């Protein structure tokens, strides 16, 4: 009842990639139970960024996942207290980007506070030379670990000319709600398609959309 059919969000983001500091803010809305959302983003400090904006995409919203098949919803359950997440994304060419995030609910609006720290993105690689074209769809595996959930995914970043640069995500999701007030899910999977809808001014304005649907494995079992 705290998370309604349509929800708005406001976001603040600050961090560094290699040696370059920046801040963003964003606002948007979506449908938490249908698992769709839109964010309109502004780089408000340090723009234009010297790196492809694509590497920030996953840092801009776990409340908007359609949890199907009765999967207990760790994220929606966490309100009013909210939750946090922390992640390491490792690119196969040396870039590493960590991020920590706080998610709260204030006067009916979701509030995100995110911090980014990326290092060792190769100065002559596709991210620094802006040869990227957004992400392929992906499937994240989530599983309970230590009272929270952990997530694992490999994502494919499309490159100019075809071809991909791969990265791996390891995420820890922590609820701010007491564990005895949470019904934990078993292992499940989130199918996701994160898409750049619009951009302008050398990526200092960006519009992103995501659709995300959670499910069990639907293959028959011999056991």
Residue numbers in the entry: 3 to 62, 66 to 228
What does the literature reporting this entry say, word for word?
At high pH (pH 9.0–10.6), this variant appears blue under ambient light, with absorbance and emission maxima shifted to 598 nm and 646 nm, respectively. In the structure of far-red-emitting GmKate (pH 10.0, determined at 1.8 Å resolution), only the cis-conformation of the chromophore was observed. The absorbance peak at 598 nm is indicative of the anionic form of the chromophore, similar to the state observed in mNeptune. Indeed, the π+-π stacking interaction between R197 and the chromophore is conserved at pH 10.0, and may further stabilize the deprotonated state of the chromophore. Chromophore-interacting residues reside in positions similar to those observed at neutral pH. The green (pH 7) to red (pH 10) shift of the absorption energy of GmKate can indeed be attributed to the change in protonation state of the chromophore from neutral at pH 7 to anionic at pH 10. In contrast to mKateS158A and mKate, GmKate has a ∼10 nm red shift in absorbance and emission maxima at pH 10. In the chromophore region, the only difference between mKateS158A and GmKatepH = 10 is the loss of a hydrogen bond due to the substitution of the S143 with a cysteine. This hydrogen bond may stabilize the highest occupied molecular orbital (HOMO) that has electron density concentrated on the phenolate motif. The loss of this hydrogen bond would thus increase the HOMO energy, which results in a decreased energy gap between HOMO and the lowest unoccupied molecular orbital (LUMO), causing a red-shift.
